[PDB]
Every structure is written in C-alpha cells, then in structure tokens.
Design a protein around this ligand. Structure first.
Ligand SMILES: *[C@@H]1O[C@H](CO)[C@@H](O)[C@H](O)[C@H]1O[C@H]1C[C@H]([NH3+])[C@@H](O)[C@H](C)O1
Ligand SMILES: *[C@H]1O[C@H](CO)[C@@H](O)[C@H](O)[C@@H]1O
Ligand SMILES: *[C@H]1C[C@H](N)[C@@H](OC)[C@H](C)O1
Length: 6
C-alpha cells in the first residue's frame, strides 16, 4: 500500500 521507488 506504500509506493516508492526505492
Ligand atoms: C504505481 O502507482 C501509479 C499511480 O497510481 C500507477 O500509475 C502505476 O502504474 C503503479 O505501478 C505499477 C507498477 C508497479 N511495479 C506495481 O507495484 C504497481 C501495483 O503497479
Ligand atoms: C522500502 O524500504 C524503506 C526503508 O526501510 C522504507 O522506508 C519504505 O517504506 C519501504 O519499505
Ligand atoms: C522508481 C523510479 C526510480 N527513479 C528508480 O530508480 C532507478 C526506481 C528503481 O524505480
């Protein structure tokens, strides 16, 4: 449920 991009 978060996103990113790391
Ligand atoms: C991430 O969210 C964006 C904005 O809502 C979408 O436009 C994008 O298509 C999404 O990224 C894709 C590819 C990604 N690797 C995957 O984890 C997500 C679910 O869908
Ligand atoms: C990727 O990892 C970073 C570092 O722990 C988090 O901040 C992020 O929420 C995701 O898990
Ligand atoms: C999300 C966008 C970001 N610029 C990328 O780093 C190379 C990451 C892997 O995906």
């Amino acid at each position: 449920x978060f996103x990113x991009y790391x």
